Amino acid sequence: STDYWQNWTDGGGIVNAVNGSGGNYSVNWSNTGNFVVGKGWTTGSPFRTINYNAGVWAPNGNGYLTLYGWTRSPLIEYYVVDSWGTYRPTGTYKGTVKSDGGTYDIYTTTRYNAPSIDGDRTTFTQYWSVRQSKRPTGSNATITFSNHVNAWKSHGMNLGSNWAYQVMATAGYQSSGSSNVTVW
């Protein structure tokens, strides 16, 4: 019952995103700048369990297969990264959390004068859970987001009171690749 289509690119290279049937989408990208594409929900929830099955996850270089969303009040961009390409994202280490058969490291980072849902020139903190090893793809996976929300809270990483979208995303950074993901 997804109802949100996320498709943002800074315009660099080619990001061929297909909004497929139901919860399904694909991305074929090449020689990109930065981009984020995914399917999910118009209003995020700290109580939502996200299901997905990545039929293809094939980054060539730097890309993430990740829960992705925002809050406002305050403005926070958040990630639950299940898999990646050549680079495992890290930042300021906060702790760990076990969820959905995985162990995730918790990080914070900051963006300065960068694109956000509030405009092209904003400064904000990012919250991360990053799986310690790449999650197997091709079978049904779950992200029990509450586990992350609560772990983040325990480290003083509180989300905002105004929930924006919440999607299961393919994100890329100066890379190429292909993905095909179904979200529900």
Curated annotation (Swiss-Prot):
Residues 1-184 form the GH11 domain. Its EC number is 3.2.1.8. It comes from the Bacteria. GO terms for molecular function: endo-1,4-beta-xylanase activity. Keywords: Carbohydrate metabolism, Glycosidase, Hydrolase, Polysaccharide degradation, Signal, Xylan degradation. Pathway: Glycan degradation; xylan degradation. The keyword DNA repair does not apply. The keyword Hydrolase applies. SUPFAM superfamilies: Concanavalin A-like lectins/glucanases. InterPro entries: ConA-like_dom_sf, GH11/12, GH11_AS_1, GH11_AS_2, GH11_dom, Glyco_hydro_11. Pfam families: Glyco_hydro_11 (PF00457). It catalyses: Endohydrolysis of (1->4)-beta-D-xylosidic linkages in xylans. The active site is at residues 77, 171. One of its GO terms (biological process) is xylan catabolic process. PANTHER family: ENDO-1,4-BETA-XYLANASE A-RELATED. Belongs to the glycosyl hydrolase 11 (cellulase G) family. This is Endo-1,4-beta-xylanase A. It comes from Bacillus subtilis (strain 168).
